[PDB]
């Protein structure tokens, strides 16, 4: 399809969604929400895609949101619209997703990055939750996902003060998978996406789903769910080919 | 008037300074009741938007009065629900800052973890040495420490009683920031001032949403936050904050 | 007893379980699972044991599993056996366990290490979750314990790419307790075990159980659990002696 705020690219088994509002420093709005989730969902249902990247510009992954949509928003309209709920569709994506974050990832932007499974950051990446300064708070999962990544003391710090966090701090805290030089961000993200998309598709979906369990229940239930999923893998051809390949000292030819 | 603490107000920030220097600010029952009383009074004061808790340069709080526990029987502890009063600190709705220098050991460390924001001096030494006394943490240590720095390190700290310096606390998830010892009180006031200057309802909601991350599934935490966020739009502070932003000025809440 | 795939030694109040499959880099398999859990269980019930070390060789804590064993498994075989469930027995051990990890700890090996309470890593340690490459996923708690230790973005990365993590990253990410020089792994692990085993046995077991609570319920419930366990500690002679010793400024003499 054609979109207005994003560009969508397919190369091999990798899909890439590039936020495209340069005049706004890739600020999120309701239209961006709708377009990204439509794109991501459409990519998720494509058998020829095994990984999805979401990225912005070198200057901004996403520097926040259009204040106009929130400025004269009333509680009635927010409640009626369930304002931001549509973002949940990105989390419902079963194929692995990778946020490639360069420069500014602030408010909504940082929240969008955290929605992704894998987070590769440029060395220029700046994260933060400055929503408090506008007299509000995170509304796209920030108080949940940030706190679960970096712990209470830092989560409370960023959310109550709005201070920024650079890439190196993001990396030692739990917020990002790894950090790479800014000129190599897109190349690294593609390489990570490539590797992931060459794994067995069900095994990757299963592995991602199992990790996601770790934030939804007791440890004891997470362990049970994982083990059962693990057992199910043995009904898949790819488990059989994967192990055979290992033993026979050769490359696995996955069928998906 | 208090015996074991000093309480001070300035603008919209309140400071509770632990005041038992002859005993390294070691916690006891009086300290528990006074700190929690002062914090609760500050929480109900609408002229207060942030609360600092700190000790001295040498020790935030080093352990506790052991004679208060030595001869306790199970029946005594159960009847008294020993340490339950500390729960009043976590119920404080206004943001709290632990400004930790020097020794934060046992209860001292647990008191620091109860606060929302933790600013440590470079001299801060954290530890859970309760095991050495033949008991364990009883003020949230096994729960808050583990959730901050992970199982491997919490197990290490709680079972060997080894201490952890400010740098390790910072890379592990225990403190928000580390600052030079001479700047601790200054920096915490700066952080407190900043928080106290935000919308009171907005910061209470933010804090409360963050606390949810430890009480339920992510699924439920996400829904709660989104509902809280929705409700913020029924506040006048929200209209002010966004209007102040457009006009590139400071909000007048 | 005597074992085929492991070695067991006892000194003072510390027990050591050494993985012993050098021909296969200590790769896990059903026998290792059964023997390791049997040994741990026996050490757990020995009153004269206060700490338990699990370790491998300097080249590998445990590099992967016998893929040969899982290769021809159908879903039915895995379902019937409840494949890997027996590992649960290790975490049911009440005495503190310490994983001393040198070299390779990949897949099941990394999962094994994470099951332990304390993890001492040699600077040569290499952690990974490469299960995905075989067209499966972590089956021994990897997706669960790794995620809880290092956070979502890093666990996703490891589990979805199979990349390795060195001891230094592991230490700053939350995965390990401490990193020491390779030549001193065993020495330092035994010092840590000696310290833990010299604590009150009951107090150590309680603190360990309290800590485990932090992954099984909400924070409010974990708080109440720990306070009540704390209350009951006052019914132990060790509480009474340990506090008396501290107050009397003398060394404690436990039971």
Swiss-Prot record, chain C:
Gene Ontology MF terms: enoyl-CoA hydratase activity
Which keywords does this Swiss-Prot/TrEMBL entry list?
Answer: Fatty acid metabolism, Lipid metabolism, Lyase
Q: Which Pfam families match?
A: ECH_1
Q: Which PROSITE patterns does the entry mention? A: ENOYL_COA_HYDRATASE
State the InterPro entries in the record. Answer: ClpP/crotonase-like_dom_sf, Enoyl-CoA_hyd/isom_CS, Enoyl-CoA_hydra/iso, Enoyl-CoA_hydra_C
Catalysed reaction, written as an equation: a (3S)-3-hydroxyacyl-CoA = a (2E)-enoyl-CoA + H2O; a 4-saturated-(3S)-3-hydroxyacyl-CoA = a (3E)-enoyl-CoA + H2O
Output the GO biological process annotations, alphabetical, semicolon-separated.
fatty acid beta-oxidation
List, alphabetically, the SUPFAM superfamilies matched. Answer: ClpP/crotonase
Query: Which Enzyme Commission number(s) are on file for it?
Result: 4.2.1.17
Q: Does Cell cycle count among this protein's keywords?
A: no
PANTHER family according to UniProt: ENOYL-COA HYDRATASE, MITOCHONDRIAL, ENOYL-COA HYDRATASE-RELATED
Give the family per the record: Belongs to the enoyl-CoA hydratase/isomerase family.
Q: What does this protein do?
A: Could possibly oxidize fatty acids using specific components.
**What name appears for this protein in its UniProt entry?**
Probable enoyl-CoA hydratase echA8
Tell me which species this is from.
Mycobacterium tuberculosis (strain CDC 1551 / Oshkosh)
Task: Give the gene name.
Answer: echA8
